[PDB]
């Protein structure tokens, strides 16, 4: 029961290190 | 997480060879990332515990749209998703090979243009040893000078003719402006 | 040395050059048109084959 | 590409004709496997090629 994560054009393929950098800081509060 | 498979794991692994060879072809002809990782995880080393993860990693390199990735994820049967991934790899390969072919075609056209220009320059330097200017028409410059020589001539026409002749010399032979200048001079 | 098929017109960026020459061989070419044709053939050889100006030169020469 | 077990089985054979025949049969089996894989791959390539040429034309259009 957590708010949906805004991917924001950051596709994440299986078993591949990826970096997500969202402009909204509200996700930082959840983190 | 469903991982149903057939008991006889003898010929099913054969398609892995084709998949890895296709990946090798893509990376060699379409270098996107460093090739060390492929060496690190070698099929012969037997350290591939979950072939599904290796297949996903290989397909992850594909440039197919995320819609195609979702379509692949929709499939449940292992062979169907394997064939879908192979088709996606072929889809990327078609575009990549077409891009390379078009690039080399344009480059070859440019090279042929430059080479024929070099042959033309060899003509202008060997048959047309510098100084004659027969094709450049500076020989025609001298011809017009001698044509004007005999005439008892006003100064106005000489100054305008000198201006015209300087313009003709400045302008290259093929220019339409050069053609009009030549016609006026004649 | 400087040209192929000597005793005649060089390829000079346009093979049909030679053809045109034979198309004029049977003809008793007047000198004025002769020099105009020679100059225009040089001009055609100066330009690249696929250029629009080269196309216009080819049309005029034909 | 015979598996290590098959290579050991070949090494087990003593008579030279026996191991030669075993190697020839292993080549036959692996060649048949590769040929079947090639034929199935060609079948799949043709079936994907069932996608009309208009699909490649649309790829070009985009």
UniProtKB/Swiss-Prot annotation, chain A:
Disulfide feature: none
Which organs or tissues contain this protein?
Duodenum, heart, lung and liver, but not thymus.
Regions annotated as coiled coil:
none
Q: Where in the cell is it found?
A: Mitochondrion matrix
Cite the record's note on assembly: Homohexamer. Organized in a ring with a central cavity. The ATP-binding and proteolytic domains (AP-domain) form a hexameric chamber, while the N-terminal domain is arranged as a trimer of dimers. DNA and RNA binding is stimulated by substrate and inhibited by ATP binding. Interacts with TWNK and mitochondrial DNA polymerase subunit POLG.
Write out the similarity annotation.
Belongs to the peptidase S16 family.
Entry domain remark: The Lon N-terminal domains are crucial for the overall structure of the protein, maintaining it in a conformation allowing its proper functioning.
What this protein is reported to do is described as: ATP-dependent serine protease that mediates the selective degradation of misfolded, unassembled or oxidatively damaged polypeptides as well as certain short-lived regulatory proteins in the mitochondrial matrix. Endogenous substrates include mitochondrial steroidogenic acute regulatory (StAR) protein, DELE1, helicase Twinkle (TWNK) and the large ribosomal subunit protein MRPL32/bL32m. MRPL32/bL32m is protected from degradation by LONP1 when it is bound to a nucleic acid (RNA), but TWNK is not. May also have a chaperone function in the assembly of inner membrane protein complexes.
Which medical condition is this protein associated with?
CODAS syndrome: A rare syndrome characterized by the combination of cerebral, ocular, dental, auricular, and skeletal features. These include developmental delay, craniofacial anomalies, cataracts, ptosis, median nasal groove, delayed tooth eruption, hearing loss, short stature, delayed epiphyseal ossification, metaphyseal hip dysplasia, and vertebral coronal clefts.
What's the protein name?
Answer: Lon protease homolog, mitochondrial
Q: Which gene encodes it?
A: LONP1
């Amino acid at each position: 029961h957590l708010p949906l994560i805004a991917i924001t054009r950051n596709p994440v393929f299986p078993r591949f290190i990826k970096i997500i950098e969202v402009k909204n800081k509200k996700l930082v509060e959840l983190l | 997480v469903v991982h149903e498979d057939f008991q006889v794991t003898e010929e099913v692994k054969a398609l892995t060879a084709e998949i890895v060879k296709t990946i090798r072809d893509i990376i060699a002809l379409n270098p996107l990332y460093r090739e060390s990782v492929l060496q690190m995880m070698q099929a012969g080393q037997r350290v591939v515990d979950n072939p599904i993860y290796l297949s996903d990693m290989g397909a992850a390199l594909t440039g197919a749209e995320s819609h195609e990735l979702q379509d692949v994820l929709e499939e449940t049967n292992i062979p169907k998703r394997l064939y879908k991934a192979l088709s996606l790899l072929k889809k990327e390969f078609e575009l990549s090979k077409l891009q390379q072919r078009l690039g080399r075609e344009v480059e070859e056209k440019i090279k042929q243009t430059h080479r024929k220009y070099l042959l033309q320059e060899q003509l202008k330097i060997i048959k047309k040893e510098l100084g004659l200017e027969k094709d450049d028409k500076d020989a025609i410059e001298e011809k017009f000078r001698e044509r004007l020589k005999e005439l008892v001539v006003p100064k106005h026409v000489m100054d305008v003719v000198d201006e015209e002749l300087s313009k003709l010399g400045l302008l290259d032979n093929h220019s339409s402006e050069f053609n009009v200048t030549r016609n006026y001079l004649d």
